[model samples]
Target: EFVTYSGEESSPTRTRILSAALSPAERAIFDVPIEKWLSIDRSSLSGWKCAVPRPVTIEQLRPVDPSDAILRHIALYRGPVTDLQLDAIVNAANTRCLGGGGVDGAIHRVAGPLLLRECATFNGCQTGECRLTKGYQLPARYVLHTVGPVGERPDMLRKCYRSILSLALKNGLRSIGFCCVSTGVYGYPLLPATRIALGETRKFLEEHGGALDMCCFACFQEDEYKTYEKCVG
Candidate 1:
């Protein structure tokens, strides 16, 4: 017989080791592959250790924009800073973070060759990691190039979002904008991608309030803009 466990929100579920008298064959059936369970070892997990013990509150988890924070919602406007902007803009970079096509290429083009030279100093970035460079020809002062995940895997998505936000905050950036990372040429699905982006942004804002003054979802296409609106609204 199969048994299930359930509990209240704040209560820990009571767990039981099934079949204390089971045969070896039966025990084998219950065993999960070590490789599967060993991927994330609690004893050795590292990177981005939270320095403080601040528990995340419900108020902190509130969405940045509440109206259209769903999926595939858009808002159109004619803005003065389309041609030139002083703030930093995010580049939907590859794992290399060495500048590629689409938004990445455009940002690199506007930033000029000097930016490439700066990137060379850091070697190549790993998947989900970010690197920063000065914006040369572009109107923006700095470009925070964040390498996003290519696949639809939730783990990759989470890592990519967290790394980008952490890097941005670490660099003391006040105003920044992000592209619809991985959803474009990389082929991360729209609705789920939008949710991840928005959720991550909201979480970051909650943790590091007032550190960033403004965060913009700088999407190129109408559909992409709609996705951002749905996520951020």
Candidate 2:
């Protein structure tokens, strides 16, 4: 029986383990969409989160399309992006990818000056485009940086998520953490941007299903966290 199997070797590493060993009948439990479970009751969420002491307040998000669940391992969390361990952390960068206030500044400061030196070589990333860099002093192994719009535009924000995820896949990063984009000092509203963010993630995961594993939306503020919970929960 191939109950709850995880494969070794390759770019798209599989970290999914279906809650320990199970009989074939038990394994069939997950054969249905996980949203079925989420829709029933709140208490059911307890088991969806990993058992370990998480570095963030984590909730496994229901997939936008049930069929896309295999492709999308989505989570919403409250914490610094640097604290969560993943293949890469997406920074809401300015066009330079050099660093600025809010999320970009914090990411750059923790990653140290060496990260800046490396980013200098990549030229500047354009809005809705991305550039990759080593995580340096930060715990994350890679930093995927992209510039978001200063205005409220769903199309451009959608472009931002698509670009970053596509870049992560090309680099063989199965898991990634995305900071809330364009909604900070950039002035895009939280809920609408969150909806667009989730929509784009669904499209990206479905399009590149086999290439990615986990995707996290990392939120630091209580109101932001609550907004994500209300919108995606």
Candidate 3:
């Protein structure tokens, strides 16, 4: 006669083996309990803005690249920045680089506390400068934290993208994802920012040629994606 097997027979052994395999540092990441987490106000974490009229099917949006081999490497994605599986995802971080609001907070939130721990080691970043860190729990392998121009300074804004791109290439990163930098709380206008973004990106790709396998623009907001669609399409 045959006996039916139950998952209970194997769960404890699997759990014990997994627990034993964890290194000390690996087990330490979860050492702090949720009650000890900093009291961060959700409202203070991001700037709230009025919603825009969205397209019927947001998923229908796609980047239309021309026949040029260099242009084909650029892509547009509409979703949370943390979801992209590129080699790295650029964070619109403040000078502190610890994590503040908008995309920065979103990335930090998903990346887990280790990102905060790693960023804290940097002290801070300058506006128009970029810093690199491990992605931790994020889908991307690395995170490029950049501080963009706060006001209407297009020069500083462009510097942010260039800094990120150059840093990525320097580290031999094959793919990178960028969100709308300076456009959210920093109040950089969408049209002008989009122009600078695509302009610099196209120029970079043209100059670099086949260095990078992919350079993706991650737009979490509908209007931001729409603006990119108009510019690149």
Among the numbered candidates, top TM-score falls to 3
Worst 10 residues of 2 by lDDT: 2-11
**lDDT of every predicted structure (CA atoms):** 0.54, 0.65, 0.69
- Summarize candidate 1's per-residue lDDT along 39-131 as a digit string, tens digits: 223223221121213422222222344453321121222221122342456677775556778888877665655455556545456666666
- Identify the superior model by TM-score, candidate 1 or candidate 3: 3
Model 2 lDDT on a 0 to 1 scale = 0.65
Say what the RMSD of model 3 is: 15.3
In order of listing, the candidates' clash counts read: 2, 0, 0
Reference-based TM-score, model 1: 0.62
Q: How accurate is candidate 3 locally (lDDT)?
A: 0.69
How should the candidates be ordered by lDDT, best one leading? 3, 2, 1
Q: Which one wins by lDDT: 1 or 3?
A: 3
TM-score for each model: 0.62, 0.69, 0.74
Q: For model 3, how does the per-residue alpha-carbon lDDT over 1-233 read when each residue is reduced to its tens digit?
A: 11111111134433343444434554454333322222222123232111212311223323365476865677788886677766788899886666878889888887766667666544468888888776656656668888888889988988888888887777677788888899998999989999899999888888988888777888888998889888887
Question: Model 2, clash count?
Answer: 0
